[PDB]
From TrEMBL, chain A:
The lineage of its organism: Viruses, Riboviria, Pararnavirae, Artverviricota, Revtraviricetes. The chain holds residues 150 to 201 of 860 of the full protein. The mature envelope protein (Env) consists of a homotrimer of non-covalently associated gp120-gp41 heterodimers. The resulting complex protrudes from the virus surface as a spike. There seems to be as few as 10 spikes on the average virion. Surface protein gp120 interacts with host CD4, CCR5 and CXCR4. Gp120 also interacts with the C-type lectins CD209/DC-SIGN and CLEC4M/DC-SIGNR (collectively referred to as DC-SIGN(R)). Gp120 and gp41 interact with GalCer. The CD4-binding region is targeted by the antibody b12. The 17 amino acids long immunosuppressive region is present in many retroviral envelope proteins. Synthetic peptides derived from this relatively conserved sequence inhibit immune function in vitro and in vivo. HIV-1 lineages are divided in three main groups, M (for Major), O (for Outlier), and N (for New, or Non-M, Non-O). The vast majority of strains found worldwide belong to the group M. Group O seems to be endemic to and largely confined to Cameroon and neighboring countries in West Central Africa, where these viruses represent a small minority of HIV-1 strains. The group N is represented by a limited number of isolates from Cameroonian persons. The group M is further subdivided in 9 clades or subtypes (A to D, F to H, J and K). Inhibitors targeting HIV-1 viral envelope proteins are used as antiretroviral drugs. Attachment of virions to the cell surface via non-specific interactions and CD4 binding can be blocked by inhibitors that include cyanovirin-N, cyclotriazadisulfonamide analogs, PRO 2000, TNX 355 and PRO 542. In addition, BMS 806 can block CD4-induced conformational changes. Env interactions with the coreceptor molecules can be targeted by CCR5 antagonists including SCH-D, maraviroc (UK 427857) and aplaviroc (GW 873140), and the CXCR4 antagonist AMD 070. This is Envelope glycoprotein gp160. The gene is env. Highly glycosylated by host. The high number of glycan on the protein is reffered to as 'glycan shield' because it contributes to hide protein sequence from adaptive immune system.
Length: 42, 92, 52, 41
């Protein structure tokens, strides 16, 4: 995914492994976190 | 009494800063040059004239602004500079 | 550690070292079976001596 | 070589764009979208 970095203008491409239970498919490769449509996560 | 005074002075400091304007939006790439207008020898390189693309009242509008900074507050990245705080903490 | 912003970072799971197996728990079978037998007898005291 | 020169615009880690990268978005201020980069070898 494309996420911000130390500076607000520049962005970075990073990756992370996730468990199936934490990631919900949207729209084969496009996914979002299960918390995106219900609450901010800390 | 010294430990209590230390704790209370820090607490009052943080209480005073807590409600003030946050400057998180300023941790952006700066384009800085040297200030050379009527500069004494002792001050060469001490002031940086830094320009940046700042947000405005509206999120979809931007403004190009500049500010003078002291050398000690600005760290070179890779004329591109950042504030020294960008890799440590948010500044209020 | 992937930095998000000043003084803030997200911790991402990196590559797995070695084989990938699932999580599991091993419950002692004899102890569990004896424990359930005890639970059943105590339940029978409330539900009946001949209740399945 | 894969120079990643960003021939015209500000070069941000997810793209190049003539108008600069927006601090409050994942796009560019006026350009909205990011442009592909030119590469040399
Ligand atoms: C605030 O935002 C504005 C835009 O909203 C931004 O202006 C843009 O700056 C970039 C570069 O800073 C401009 O793109 C340049 O185009 C020229 C064309 O001749 C290139 O030569 C430039 O550099 C190239 O060459 C360098 C040396 O080899 C390379 O290192 C570099 O990567 C390039 O290959 C560069 O591409 C862009 O045109 C302007 N846009 C406008 C509308 O003027 C401004 O810089 C931002 N200010 C701050 C302080 O962030
Ligand atoms: C990160 O952002 C870039 C820029 O938007 C994405 O790359 C674009 O992907 C679309 C896919 O339809 C292409 O049409 C664009 O031409 C691409 N632009 C560039 C500059 O590459 C990229 O896919 C994003 N990455 C993730 C993981 O979402
Ligand atoms: C947040 O998104 C999840 C993921 O879609 C929603 O969960 C779905 O809700 C529908 C409607 O009840 C069910 O049919 C699906 O089975 C649920 N799961 C999935 C994976 O789609 C959830 O309802 C959404 N919540 C809000 C408040 O929008
Ligand atoms: C996860 O996916 C990435 C690709 O998105 C795999 O490849 C590595 O990706 C990183 C990106 O930060 C590169 O720096 C590495 O060089 C890539 N590896 C190679 C061999 O080129 C990554 O291996 C995948 N990890 C797992 C555990 O599946
Ligand atoms: C600013 O001053 C430093 C002093 O070391 C010098 O190296 C640098 O080139 C100067 N930059 C400009 C734009 O005058
Ligand atoms: C943050 O940046 C400064 C200046 O380049 C550097 O000395 C320091 O090691 C960096 N990392 C931190 C503070 O974790
Ligand atoms: C749990 O692990 C210990 C070793 O630390 C072992 O002695 C014990 O028998 C194990 N119990 C079960 C139920 O596997
Ligand atoms: C559990 O114990 C009972 C005796 O109380 C025995 O009849 C039964 O076969 C045992 N079950 C297992 C799985 O060992
Ligand atoms: C059930 O069995 C117990 C012996 O464990 C006995 O004392 C009790 O009277 C029995 N109750 C009935 C209803 O048979």
């Amino acid at each position: 995914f494309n996420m911000t970095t130390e500076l607000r203008d520049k962005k970075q491409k990073v990756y992370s492994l996730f468990y199936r239970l934490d990631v919900v498919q949207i729209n084969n490769k496009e996914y979002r976190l299960i918390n995106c449509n219900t609450s901010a996560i800390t | 009494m010294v430990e209590q005074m230390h704790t209370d002075i820090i607490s009052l400091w943080d209480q005073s800063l807590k409600p003030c304007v946050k400057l998180t939006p300023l941790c952006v790439t700066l384009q800085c040059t040297n200030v050379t207008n009527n500069i004494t020898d002792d001050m060469r390189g001490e002031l940086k004239n830094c320009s940046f693309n700042m947000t405005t009242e509206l999120r979809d509008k931007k403004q190009k602004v500049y500010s003078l900074f002291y050398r000690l507050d600005v760290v070179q990245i890779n004329k591109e500079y950042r504030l020294i705080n960008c890799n440590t903490s948010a500044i209020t | 550690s992937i930095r998000i912003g000043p003084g803030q970072a997200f911790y991402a799971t990196g590559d797995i070292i070695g084989d990938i197996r699932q999580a599991h728990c091993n419950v002692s079978k004899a102890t569990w079976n004896e424990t359930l037998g005890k639970v059943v007898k105590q339940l029978r005291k409330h539900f009946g001596n001949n209740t399945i | 070589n894969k120079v990643k020169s960003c021939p015209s615009g500000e070069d941000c880690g997810i793209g190049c764009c003539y108008h600069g990268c927006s601090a409050t978005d994942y796009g560019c201020w006026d350009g909205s979208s990011y442009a592909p980069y030119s590469y040399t070898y």
